[PDB]
Amino acid sequence: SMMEINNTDGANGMERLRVDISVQADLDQLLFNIPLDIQLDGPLRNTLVGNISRYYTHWSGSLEMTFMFCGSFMATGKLILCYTPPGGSCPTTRETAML
Amino acid sequence: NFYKDSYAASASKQDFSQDPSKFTEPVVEGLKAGAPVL
Amino acid sequence: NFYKDSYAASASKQDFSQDPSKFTEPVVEGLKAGAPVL
Amino acid sequence: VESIIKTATDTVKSEINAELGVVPSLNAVETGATSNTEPEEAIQTRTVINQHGVSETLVENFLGRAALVSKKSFEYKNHASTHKNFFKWTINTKSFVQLRRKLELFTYLRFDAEITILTTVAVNYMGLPDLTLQAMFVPTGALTPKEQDSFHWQSGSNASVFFKISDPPARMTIPFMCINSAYSVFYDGFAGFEKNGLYGINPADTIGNLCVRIVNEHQPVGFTVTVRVYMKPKHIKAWAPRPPRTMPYMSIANANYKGRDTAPNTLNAIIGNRASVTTMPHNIV
Amino acid sequence: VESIIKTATDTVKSEINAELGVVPSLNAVETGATSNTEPEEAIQTRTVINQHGVSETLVENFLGRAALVSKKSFEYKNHASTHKNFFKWTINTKSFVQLRRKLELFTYLRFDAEITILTTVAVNYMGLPDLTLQAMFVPTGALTPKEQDSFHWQSGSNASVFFKISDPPARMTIPFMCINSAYSVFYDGFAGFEKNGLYGINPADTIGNLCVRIVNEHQPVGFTVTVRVYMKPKHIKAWAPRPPRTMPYMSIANANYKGRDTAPNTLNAIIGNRASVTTMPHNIV
Amino acid sequence: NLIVPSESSDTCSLIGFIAAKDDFSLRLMRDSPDIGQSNHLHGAEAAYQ
Amino acid sequence: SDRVLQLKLGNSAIVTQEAANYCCAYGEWPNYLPDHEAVAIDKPTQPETSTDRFYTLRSVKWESNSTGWWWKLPDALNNIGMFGQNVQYHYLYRSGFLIHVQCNATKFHQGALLVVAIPEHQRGAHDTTTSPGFNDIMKGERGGTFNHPYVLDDGTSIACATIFPHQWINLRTNNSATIVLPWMNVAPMDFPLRHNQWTLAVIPVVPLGTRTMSSVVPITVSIAPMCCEFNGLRHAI
Amino acid sequence: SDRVLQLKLGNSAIVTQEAANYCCAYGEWPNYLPDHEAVAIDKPTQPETSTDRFYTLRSVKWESNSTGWWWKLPDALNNIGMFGQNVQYHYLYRSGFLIHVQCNATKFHQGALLVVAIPEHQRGAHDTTTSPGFNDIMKGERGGTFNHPYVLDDGTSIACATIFPHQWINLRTNNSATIVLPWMNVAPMDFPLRHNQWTLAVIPVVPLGTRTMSSVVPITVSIAPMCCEFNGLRHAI
Amino acid sequence: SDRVLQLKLGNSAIVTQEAANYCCAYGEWPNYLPDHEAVAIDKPTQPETSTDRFYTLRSVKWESNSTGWWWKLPDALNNIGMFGQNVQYHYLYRSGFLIHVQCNATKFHQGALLVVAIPEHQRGAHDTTTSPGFNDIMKGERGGTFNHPYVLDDGTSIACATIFPHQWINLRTNNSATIVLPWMNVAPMDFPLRHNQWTLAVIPVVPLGTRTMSSVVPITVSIAPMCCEFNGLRHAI
């Protein structure tokens, strides 16, 4: 089910369900990040897994995030999605996230 | 259950059968492991 | 136990197995009856 | 594809992949199917014999809980000069939000209903009377008593349960009594042949009426009596899961919505806001 | 070396010893092993068929006792103008010293917990009301009710037990619910990713919250209601025994110590003093 | 980088989805924090009339 | 191979060269009412080809600010062709549905439509305690539009609507969505004029956009009833 | 079929939907050092997943006047992740490499990059008898650029560079190049901080061009060490 | 025969000619995490020799008035060698430990040290209700000292500390103590930077004494992780 990644002031209704990316002028740009606690309020809370998990207290298992690109056919690009196990601050550079 | 009507019985917590695919993969053509979906 | 969850059962006071040596003799080399320990 | 699942699936060790024509991590959301990429194909995994149980999420257990469905306080006294020592309640599972939301995670439900009635008393001090109450089941739309001492309480055919406040809560099971094979948690229609009926209300899904009175005649002083009714569905069968309710409920008669004044759960934003899409909430400092 | 022991070991008769190279009474404490000298080797013994049982010291029995873990008194009355007819208690086994010390004789423990709730009442005389109470289990850190009449008491999923003061103490079993294979009686760490968390507190070992309220509305007069909760661990498994606590406890949040003002159990001297190492206390005159 | 020709929009959207795999397990049921009430819902009292 | 598809029922046929496989709601397929599930005892009429065929409704225009559209079944078809006639002359009806939503654009256009079949989609009204009226629900062939698609006009959410049978029409990928719907009800048959088993919802989660020549981009819905059966014959309503 | 590809090593994975098959240098594949070829007698450490994974370096911008870029191995990775740590704590290292160069554009863009893996690419300096200095050779993660790609900065020629393991990224055809490199040396192992077995060179033989909207067209390099082994453990340098 | 001993792991070896046998905590021996007890599903890295080797910490001086010393594991080693690197780059770790405490003197010296490995040694603070702070617990390679060894700084007692895996170093008898520690936790793996499985405590129950020439008598600790495994790879913390 859809993650509400764009949960920001100024984003209303469905605008909150999509993340817009633009042609960049600089390299290795950070596009967005996502907090991963399916037990807390955030982009993952109002999802099938989030909602049902919140009727419980303990959880275990792998999660899967799928992203669908909705630009035009003539649009191209390569993105890197990184999952960083806990321990420190969220990475802010690709060279760190990439690890 | 000492009652005569079966609906009075205690809960039935033994149905462990599942079929997620009716919700996760309701597509007419089965999708392969790593082959292009399209 | 008439409950459906096994953890609801009464106490289990029948485990008579022991192995004091894990606390009394955790030495790698077994010590003999009256032979010098060193 | 039906099978018996008693534990979470195991993980198999996986090795390096460099196969042309094979792209397990790519999918087509447009088909409507959920991604079928397995962990073993996304990263290198080890073998794990998973023993985690899956029984606490069985529908029978998920819905198998005695939830509060009715709470009613009334005055037990001389009503010479309002619920006069008795009340009538049209059974419904839409008044208390916790139960309502869970039931509404499904489109259709078939279950028997275990009813438990808890009674409490408070003086309006010389002690609390151990009163006898009568709860009579009266079919939806059927004839209900209009007075505490009505002859209608003779309950010749209706089922009645008499219980004391000093006894444990009364309990009984109402079978799955719908005229259909399952209850409609949601009903996209009008249950009447004309066009002025109520939308979304199919009486076929209204279990019935619960008429409760204090059997004792009034005492010289008044008391406040509160009756709480709990319902636990059992022998459950469920169909077509649905999107969970997010907006606060407004009425028991419909799904009307307004949303909270500010996020979370406001019509404009379900999830609370963060400064930006690159701002990590609860970031470890 | 694992074996089944049901009685204390027997003694075998022994004879005179005069063997060169054999010195059973000599040992080397430095190895860390406890002396293995047998009575038969230290003195001349007779044969004794020992029938003394060893079952009362089984861990299951040693810890198998319903110990007081919580005692709470509050006023049941009109709180128009403090625990207003209800209270919330974060379950812990660190508040009452007898249970605490026994549990702390072990490093790790795995057990199911039988909970028994005893309720008592006293008028602040015209009789004692037979009130109905509700004890709702709310996961550690989870949402607890803030008022006696809060809608949160509808307990749609949380487990709630309703009981009367005139009934026997309420009782139920909370399973071993840790996210790990055993509870950590002691935790040498900080359960947070930052450095400002509490030391020695692993929430994984906090069974949960017990929210208790009186269901009845207040009476015209006030009462003092006391709720006592007892816990009996069962189906126990224990690991790594530890040095018993000697210094009086100071806090439920840590092992901080100060010691009594004077021996015994003073930081400076655990055992009470005697005049000298050649002074025999309680010497027979 | 996201690269598009003159006639394609230069700002595109992604829709992110999430789900559990079949190695998932949930324990210790509790009331959901996502729904609550402080008053009677409209029409609730009418069920007694 | 799973991008091209032809659907043929009765005297109607549809082809698409940019499909995304196709959905069979809950993994089922339509079928006639078996004797062991029947209730009405009169011999039913099974028109076959005169009713089990594609009916194309009027198109709608996808605009930059559109909120979404919906059509309820069988209401949307209760006054169309022979299916409509049988529905009007019979007290009881039963059938599955083959749904085909169409929308094509350009390789320079972008946009994504969620095409979902919702069972028992009971609408809610916004900011009022008054329940939706008859005319708010029964729109017929014209269908209706969403007021607050974000919460599916029922206080829930479109984010979790994927729990229902669906597909998407992502312009860069495909130009059509196909969903096969079996009979969905708690009763073996029903009165077609007062209850809608399914609701077809088409919602633009990602708005239509481009920098090329603007053209009207329509969205068209074609629906074919399947395995139709009718009981309780009388005069037309 | 030979246009799509997924590479998975350790906790990293990469997919491309426009590949051109892929190259296995000299038809070989990486492997651990066999006992009959070993020299160092201490038991080696084989970290596997902590080192044999994709490391993505900072991207470079392909400009109309670019001359080309190069990255030396293992130098480019000697200070990255666990591979870098093992390299710093051990006197000896050994490994193969899986190289994936990425560059996408538009169907209106043109350009062709020669992506070649050169063994022992000993650079030459231009118009001087003085040999290249340490800082002219050891660029690390940043890599360097070609001064005279026409002669591969070594007095030979790029025209004959195809004699080395390579692929091309011709924008109208593909958007990535993949080369699998086996251990290439005259010794079974080597000191990673003073000698580079391979040099990855990316050179635009046909310049980037278009008449559509100008956008920054990056070139990205991802490199995954393979079958890493380390000997001669000590403190970190 | 049980007085001499050689321990060899990786590129490190230690011998003692005055041992007192050696202790295997709870009669167990270290081992890798079996599939039937595993939780984290990513393939772990098992560095072997680069981490499973002896690390010698800075020595401490045994003085006539010393109260005792302690080192927590893995904290004491979280920033040492390759073990430290793996710990910093991975969220999860697991390992046993081979502990060797060293202290030699003269046949004219006397003194007795209790060398005990305490599982989950949760320290208590003295004469205050405030719990110990982060810096009171995490001392790293330097280790800490006992304030009130008599009660093991936790309100219990050193007299009964023999219930834990231990040995003694009684100067007239031996000059070293050896303890093999298996993984000790309620979880199969853990986050190394916030939780210490074991605490090595060295306490002089019988003070150092002599009437011969005074010399500095050091106490040295060498610790070798065993069967190290790491999961959850990312950047270094």
Ligand SMILES: CC(=O)N[C@H]1[C@H]([C@H](O)[C@H](O)CO)O[C@@](OC[C@H]2O[C@@H](O[C@H]3[C@H](O)[C@@H](O)[C@H](O)O[C@@H]3CO)[C@H](O)[C@@H](O)[C@H]2O)(C(=O)O)C[C@@H]1O
């Ligand atoms: C029924 C309902 O609306 N439930 C939501 C719940 C409630 O709105 C709040 O509990 C009302 O107090 O909020 C949920 O999301 C959490 C919110 O947290 C807010 O900040 C809190 C912070 O998290 C607390 O730790 C702190 O003690 O108080 C802060 C507020 O002063 C955010 O500002 C808000 O946006 C939410 O993120 C919840 O999970 O409880 C979501 C429920 O659906």
